[PDB]
């Protein structure tokens, strides 16, 4: 019944792993089967785990009484992961990266044995790329935080307005209907008298 | 709704000073709109009936046509940008019922609210349903 | 199943019927048409479709089985139910949320 045991670390680390295709699946069920791992026999693993677990008392499944979820309106919240770096620092870094200093830094990057001249500049060039990617994320997050503050204010004001006016309309309707019923009841009582 | 579709007949009389129609609060509100638009001389509420005093001009009546849109067997609703297109280039009165009361299509268009199209008065030949 | 076109989904009739159908958490309202079985009720729910060709809305009935932990929904009571995402047993698929109108008992 159970699947072969595998660490939660492997579960997490396989998050972006593309599952096998048709031919790659066919390569996993051939007879030479050299790829099978430890304690990973298709025919035996589930039964082995079941038998090992039977040696102890089984904990019963959870008793699940269905209940209805409450209804809550969606509320926009402040952005969480916003860097605090300064726009001045971001501007200096962008000026360096997008100016003529990046090309000179690439030219000045040192070489390691086994790499062609292009690669050693490419790796330094990619090092600057990881920096600019981080700079864009900070600016986007800060701007998004500002826009979200504005939007939250707008939504709060709209909600307050709608709630208040609907409450007033309901109060007016209830008062009118109550007065109508108040007169009707006395009229009916007099008729029954 | 049935009472309004009935009152259409009483409103479309010719060669008559006044005509009676069935009573209903919706009828009273539509009559209020008509009088504010200056299409009837007036009206009177008498128990189960309403007596509409009609208005004429140079022999012919002021109300030359009534087109019913929303019938009790079928509602008709419009968004503001559909109401604008449907009432395009027309001097007629299209009566609209909204959460803000029974008003004219021009009030509805300025308010940008969704409404239910009841009647069209002096709208010539302009309808879609 | 019926598919509405992009321009059709912007019309007032379509939007209003969609608004009528929709509720928070996809809840529905109906009345009890079966209360023999324990902790279970069959509920008939009003559902509306907008026909573009004739520009009017017609009503049909949706009958589903819900779960009633207690015994408070009898035959002819108006109730609000919520979907589960799973089928308890062979029938039940919703869960009672609240009782709106109760037919007199005893």
């Amino acid at each position: 019944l159970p699947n072969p045991s595998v660490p939660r670390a492997a579960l997490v680390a396989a998050r972006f792993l593309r599952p096998p295709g048709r031919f790659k699946r066919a390569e996993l069920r051939e007879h030479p089967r050299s790829k099978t791992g430890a304690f990973a026999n298709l025919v035996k693993t589930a039964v082995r785990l079941r038998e090992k677990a039977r040696a102890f008392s089984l904990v019963p499944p959870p008793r699940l009484i269905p209940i209805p979820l409450p209804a809550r309106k969606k509320h926009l919240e402040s952005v969480r992961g916003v860097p605090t770096v300064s726009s001045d620092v971001l501007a200096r870094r962008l000026h360096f990266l997008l100016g003529p200093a990046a090309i000179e830094q690439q030219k000045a990057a040192k070489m390691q044995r086994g790499l062609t001249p292009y690669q050693t500049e490419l790796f330094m060039w990619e090092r600057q790329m990881r920096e600019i990617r981080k700079i864009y994320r900070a600016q986007y997050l800060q701007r998004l935080a500002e826009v979200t503050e504005e939007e939250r204010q707008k939504q709060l004001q709209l909600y307050l307005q709608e709630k208040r006016e609907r409450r007033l309309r309901r109060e007016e309707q209830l008062q009118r209907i109550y007065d109508d019923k108040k007169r009707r009841a006395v009229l009916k009582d007099r008729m029954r008298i | 709704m049935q009472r309004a579709c009935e009152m259409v007949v009483s409103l479309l009389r010719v060669d008559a000073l006044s005509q009676r129609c069935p009573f209903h609060v919706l009828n009273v509100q539509i009559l209020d709109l008509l009088q504010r638009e200056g299409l009837i001389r007036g009206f009177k509420v008498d128990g189960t009936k309403i007596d509409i005093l009609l208005k004429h001009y140079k022999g012919a009546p002021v109300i030359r046509n009534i087109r019913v849109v929303s019938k009790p067997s079928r509602d008709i609703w419009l968004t503001p940008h559909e109401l604008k297109f449907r009432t395009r280039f027309n001097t007629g009165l299209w009566i609209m019922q909204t959460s803000c009361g029974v008003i004219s299509h021009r009030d509805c268009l300025r308010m940008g609210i969704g409404g239910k199209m009841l009647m069209a008065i002096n709208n010539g030949y302009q309808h879609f349903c | 199943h019926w598919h509405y076109k992009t321009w059709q989904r912007n019309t007032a009739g379509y939007l209003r019927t969609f608004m009528r159908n929709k509720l928070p958490n996809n809840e529905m309202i109906g009345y009890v048409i079966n209360d023999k079985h324990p902790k279970s009720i069959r509920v008939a729910c009003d559902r509306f479709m907008y026909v573009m060709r004739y520009k009017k809305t017609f009503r049909y009935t949706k009958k589903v089985w819900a779960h009633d932990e207690e015994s408070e929904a009898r035959l002819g009571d108006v109730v609000r139910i919520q979907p589960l995402g799973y089928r308890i047993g062979p029938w039940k698929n919703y869960v009672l949320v609240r009782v709106l109108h109760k037919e007199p008992r005893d």
Partner: peptide, 19 residues
């Protein structure tokens, strides 16, 4: 008021009697 189905009629009632 268009759709006077059973549920609609049950929910649309202000009082027992319409005097």
């Amino acid at each position: 008021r268009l759709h006077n189905s059973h549920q609609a009629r049950v929910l649309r009632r202000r009082h027992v009697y319409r005097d």
